[PDB]
Amino acid sequence: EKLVQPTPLLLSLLKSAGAQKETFTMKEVLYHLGQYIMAKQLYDEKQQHIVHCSNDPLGELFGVQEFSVKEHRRIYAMISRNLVS
Ligand SMILES: COc1cc(C(N)=O)ccc1NC(=O)[C@@H]1N[C@@H](CC(C)(C)C)[C@@]2(C(=O)Nc3cc(Cl)sc32)[C@H]1c1cccc(Cl)c1F
């Protein structure tokens, strides 16, 4: 319901994934990040539901080599740090 404004980096990635506006609802951010991840194929079975983003700008976005898609509080947290408002 609330609209959030992404930082330039998170923005360039969302657009690159299909987004066509510069403010979103959290659900939209997650939706597009999902597509980005599927696109650049950073998610794998095996693993343990892990996104490997060590050579990707997403890794710089979130500041990690990888993460579990299974703990939403962390993800929302890594995302909130890239929300300008
Ligand atoms: C197959 O997918 C899973 C499998 C398992 C499992 N243990 O079997 C757990 C979890 C998932 N997936 C997910 O939660 C949800 N699937 C992820 C997408 C993905 C392509 C990685 C499968 C997820 C999503 O939908 N957008 C998004 C953006 C991220 Cl950065 S991450 C993520 C997860 C997610 C959904 C809703 C809210 C949040 Cl905060 C969230 F992080």
Side-chain angles (χ1 to χ4, degrees), residues 26-27 29-38 42-43 48-51 58 61-62 67-79:
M26 187 58 51
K27 190 162 146 77
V29 175
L30 281 166
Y31 171 65
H32 290 305
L33 264 178
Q35 298 297 303
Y36 179 93
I37 292 165
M38 288 169 135
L42 303 205
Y43 171 80
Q48 195 176 346
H49 314 286
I50 300 299
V51 175
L58 177 64
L61 188 61
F62 283 168
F67 55 90
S68 191
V69 295
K70 184 184 303 152
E71 45 211 67
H72 294 177
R73 288 177 224 104
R74 283 197 47 229
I75 291 189
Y76 285 121
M78 294 180 295
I79 295 187

Side-chain angles (χ1 to χ4, degrees), residues 3-11 22 79-85:
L3 294 178
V4 301
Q5 185 203 325
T7 54
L9 181 55
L10 172 45
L11 199 56
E22 302 178 357
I79 295 187
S80 295
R81 291 190 259 278
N82 309 240
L83 302 183
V84 179
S85 55

